[PDB]
Each structure stands twice: as structure tokens, then as C-alpha cells.
């Protein structure tokens, strides 16, 4: 399989060789609006920028900035919203993109505090009674429900828009168990989570694209997307064996810049890729 080329790097060590080189290989495109003054405080620090030709646009005349991408993957077809870890005072724009771009599901892969230090706003409610309004987008969220699993927790959340009265269910999917430092040592979690994530309709056509995100210079976004991608071509192409996971994560940073921070990061991935393509 692709666990040849898997076996062979390990082999002879060359994660890293492997890693500069898709790092130098990956396309650079300018993030105009993204440097703008005007947004430095809707910048999360330390974090990436979005290219403009793929950043997701608010649909509000003033300011529609906000630190997040489109990545359409086209022969999969399927797509994704990668977003920074909302801010104190990006919360409102955050559920903004998720309503006007009809979000099923959102996909959190970090916690609210790692390493001792805040990684993103509590941007979503911990009681069904003490609901969150945000004045500045006019939309209400409310907790409807919350099962905390053993690596993981779903939560249903009621995003209402306070200017229509309109409503609607977004799943809320928290991928609890990441390490604070590396990458899990075994891909079993992570992929059961992607499982209960495309089982839930949320990655589907017949919605708008997820809303995934992590936390400033960790990652992890681009390895649920790749895994995710890679996959799905698998099981859709004539030759399963002619997925390069190299060619699609180039493909796939076309969209975004740092998806897969590391070379253990890339490993995973392959590591992923290479398990839950036997599970399935």
C-alpha cells in the first residue's frame, strides 16, 4: 500500500527531509486583508493568516474579515471551513460564518486550556439554562444536549438568528484527548471521531461546509481534512493505491498555510490514512 512508503521512511528516518520538502514544495499567496490594521484584533497571535483568494468572507458592509478558508476539494467533493480558535471578541463573527455559510457541524480539535494557557474563547455554553447572545451579530446559542464520551464529546447546540427568529441545530464536535505535546501514539481515537463526525450528516453535501479548528500553531485541522479526503478518494477511485497523501495535502494547503505543523504531525497523518483505510 501507501504503508510501504510508510515502512521505508521509517526506515531511514526521513520524516523531517520528507516534511522541509512538502514545507518548501507548498504554495505562498498573499493574505492582503488578513494584514489589514483594521483586523489586527480579529488576528489570533502566533496564529496563521487566510490567503484572500479562499478567506470566508461575513456578510456584513463594514468589516467581513475573519480568520478563516474555504478548502474545496474538488475530486472528493467535499469541502471545509478552517478557522483560528475564536477570540474573546470573535465569538460573534465565528457563529456569524457559521449560519451564513449554512454549517452543519462545528469540529473542535483541541481543549479550552492546554500547556496550562487559554487555546480559545469559551465561545459556546456549559449550561442548557445560562445561554450565550451576541450582541454585536444578533444571534442567540443555547446547549440542547451534551454526551461526554471517554475521547470525546458531542454537543447540540440552537443557533437562533435574533434578527429573523429563524433557528437552527449545529452539532458541536470536541475531540477531547490530543496530547498537550505530539500527536496520539495510536490513530484509533482520532479516527472514531472522524467516524461519529461523518456519521452525523455533518461533512455532507446537502449541508455548508464544517467548521473545523484548533488552536495557534498546533495543527491538527488539516490532519482530520487530510485523513478525511484521502479516505473518501480511496473509496472512490478505480486504484485506491494512487492517493498520495503528499499530492493531496499540497493540494489541500492550495487553501490554507499550516495544515500539518510537523513532521510527527505528517507521520500521523500517513499513520491514519494507512489505519482507517484498512477499517474500511
Known amino acids: 500500500e501507501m504503508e510501504k512508503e510508510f515502512e521505508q521512511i521509517d526506515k531511514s ?3 523531517a527531509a520528507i516534511y522541509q520538502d512538502i514545507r518548501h514544495e507548498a504554495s505562498d499567496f498573499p ?3 488578513a494584514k489589514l490594521p483594521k483586523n489586527k484584533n480579529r488576528n489570533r497571535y502566533r496564529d ?7 478567506r470566508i468572507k461575513l456578510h456584513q458592509e463594514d468589516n467581513d474579515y475573519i480568520n478563516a478558508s474555504l478548502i474545496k476539494m474538488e475530486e472528493a467533493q467535499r469541502s471545509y471551513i478552517l478557522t483560528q480558535g475564536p477570540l474573546p471578541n470573535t465569538c460573534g463573527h465565528f457563529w456569524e460564518m457559521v449560519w451564513e455559510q449554512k454549517s452543519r457541524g462545528v469540529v473542535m480539535l483541541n ?14 455554553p456549559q449550561k442548557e439554562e ?35 427568529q429563524e433557528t437552527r441545530e449545529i452539532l458541536h464536535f470536541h475531540y477531547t484527548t490530543w496530547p498537550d505535546f505530539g500527536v496520539p501514539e495510536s490513530p484509533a481515537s482520532f479516527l472514531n471521531f472522524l467516524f461519529k463526525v461523518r456519521e452525523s450528516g455533518s461533512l455532507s453535501p446537502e449541508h455548508g461546509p464544517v467548521v473545523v479548528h484548533a488552536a495557534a500553531g498546533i495543527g491538527r485541522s ?17 486504484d ?11 493540494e489541500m ?22 489505519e482507517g483505510a484498512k477499517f474500511i
Open 253 to 274: 494547503r492550495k487553501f490554507r498555510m499550516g495544515l500539518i505543523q510537523t513532521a510527527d504531525q505528517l507521520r500521523f497523518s500517513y499513520l491514519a490514512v494507512i
Open 31 to 33: 493574505c492582503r486583508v
Open 130 to 164: 445560562k445561554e450565550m447572545i451576541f450582541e454585536d451579530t444578533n444571534l442567540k446559542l443555547t446547549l440542547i444536549s451534551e454526551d461526554i464520551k471517554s475521547y470525546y464529546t458531542v454537543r447540540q447546540l440552537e443557533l437562533e438568528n435574533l434578527t429573523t
Open 111 to 124: 481543549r479550552v486550556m492546554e500547556k496550562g494557557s487559554l487555546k480559545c474563547a469559551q465561545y459556546w
Open 240 to 250: 485506491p493505491s494512487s492517493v498520495d497523501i503528499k499530492k493531496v495535502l499540497l
Open 222 to 238: 488539516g490532519t482530520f481534512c487530510l485523513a478525511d479526503t484521502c479516505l473518501l478518494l480511496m473509496d472512490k477511485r478505480k
Open 48 to 54: 496563521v493568516s487566510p490567503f484572500d483568494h479562499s
Open 13 to 15: 528516518g526521513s520524516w
